[PDB]
UniProtKB/Swiss-Prot annotation:
This is DNA cross-link repair 1A protein. The chain holds residues 700 to 1040 of 1040 of the full protein. Binds constitutively to TP53BP1. Binds CDC27, which is itself a component of the anaphase promoting complex (APC). Binds PIAS1. Coiled coil: none annotated. It is found in: Nucleus. May be required for DNA interstrand cross-link repair. Also required for checkpoint mediated cell cycle arrest in early prophase in response to mitotic spindle poisons. Possesses beta-lactamase activity, catalyzing the hydrolysis of penicillin G and nitrocefin. Exhibits no activity towards other beta-lactam antibiotic classes including cephalosporins (cefotaxime) and carbapenems (imipenem). The gene is DCLRE1A. The lineage of its organism: Eukaryota, Metazoa, Chordata, Craniata, Vertebrata. Belongs to the DNA repair metallo-beta-lactamase (DRMBL) family. Expressed in brain, heart, kidney, liver, pancreas, placenta and skeletal muscle. Induction: During mitosis. The mRNA encoding this protein contains an internal ribosome entry site (IRES) in its 5'-UTR. This 5'-UTR generally suppresses translation while specifically promoting expression during mitosis, when cap-dependent translation may be impaired. Signal peptide: none annotated.
Length: 341
């Protein structure tokens, strides 16, 4: 059955709750972003109102064939009324189209649901600054102090310099980037830009990218793999066997692959600096695991919550084990005592 942390009290609303059948007494289903653990259950047969961003609405219409009449896109940073309740969508700094949702309950309670987010100080200057939040439904994916990672900017710098050096030393090297969902587009777009290439990809992936309102996208992407030296492949194919195979398919146009796997976190972060990352190499194939995250680090998440000062926190991630739940609760208490709320 639908867990309590997907229900918004004092409303008929649920968040990211599409895999439970008909939720009893739900009058509107909100979708924070187009990732499969969150949309799981939607299709052309869904007949209840879905509230989301424009971008997420483009993906629902074109990738899952949800019918237009049940898609209710909302503009960002705008007070809107949904079944008699004021709501605002804010940018979550996650993947394209991902939002946080502010609910203003008729009784005066104010609820923020972060969906998935990467907290940023820029959030401290949105419509969040304007009123108090009583309950926070928090993306706790990396809510433990071992999770440190670099900025997105530092990671992209590393990738661009790496790719540019390699191809300039060997103009017959191919660059490959892995993907399994939307998000992380900067990785492959930034590399293609420095190399003067388009990114080549499957028709299905090109279709997905065309739903995202990215400026000048027709100029950065293509389905002609032959004309491209940056190729996008499914994440599963980013291994020595899948890459050797791919290289065969290029018909002696290339003699070396440099591949990138943008992971969330990996334990080399506790020790290693971004400056100090090295690939795994086999023959003429090298694979770089880079820590490009679209979720908050522990320190980013802590700063956000200590700024917001919510009266109650409801975690939405890592809730399935008692040891996880109890450890998170302990962090929340520390943060509250250190900050004085
Ligand atoms: Ni996500």
């Amino acid at each position: 059955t639908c867990p309590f942390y997907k229900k918004i009290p004092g409303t008929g609303f649920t968040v990211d709750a599409f895999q439970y059948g008909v939720v009893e007494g739900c009058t509107a289903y909100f979708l924070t972003h187009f990732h499969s653990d969150h949309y799981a259950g939607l299709s052309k047969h869904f007949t209840f109102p879905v509230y989301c961003s424009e971008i997420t609405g483009n993906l629902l219409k074109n990738k899952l064939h949800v019918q237009e009449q049940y898609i209710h896109p909302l503009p960002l940073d705008t007070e809107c009324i949904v079944n008699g309740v004021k709501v605002v969508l804010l940018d979550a700094n996650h993947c394209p189209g991902a939002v946080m949702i502010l609910f203003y309950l008729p009784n005066g309670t104010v609820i923020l649901h972060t969906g998935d987010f990467r907290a940023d100080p820029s959030m401290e200057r949105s419509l969040l600054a304007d009123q108090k939040v009583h309950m926070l439904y928090l993306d706790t994916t990396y809510c433990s102090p071992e999770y440190t990672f670099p900025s997105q900017q530092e990671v992209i710098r590393f990738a661009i310099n790496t790719a540019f050096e390699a191809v300039t030393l060997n103009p017959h090297a191919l660059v490959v980037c892995g993907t399994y969902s939307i998000g992380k587009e900067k990785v492959f777009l930034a590399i293609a830009d420095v190399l003067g290439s388009k990114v080549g990809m499957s028709q299905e992936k090109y279709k997905t990218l065309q739903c995202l309102n990215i400026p000048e996208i027709n100029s950065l992407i293509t389905t002609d793999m032959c004309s491209s030296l940056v190729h996008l492949l499914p994440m599963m194919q980013i291994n020595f066997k899948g890459l050797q195979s791919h290289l065969k398919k290029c018909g002696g146009k290339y003699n070396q692959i440099l591949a990138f796997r943008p992971t969330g976190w990996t334990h080399s972060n506790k020790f290693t600096r971004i400056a100090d990352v090295i690939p795994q190499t086999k023959g003429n194939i090298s694979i770089y695991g880079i820590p490009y995250s679209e979720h908050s680090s522990y320190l980013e998440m802590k700063r956000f919550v200590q700024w917001l000062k919510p009266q109650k926190i409801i975690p939405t991630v890592n809730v399935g084990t008692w040891k996880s739940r109890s450890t998170m609760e302990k962090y929340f208490r520390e943060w509250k005592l250190e900050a004085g709320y």
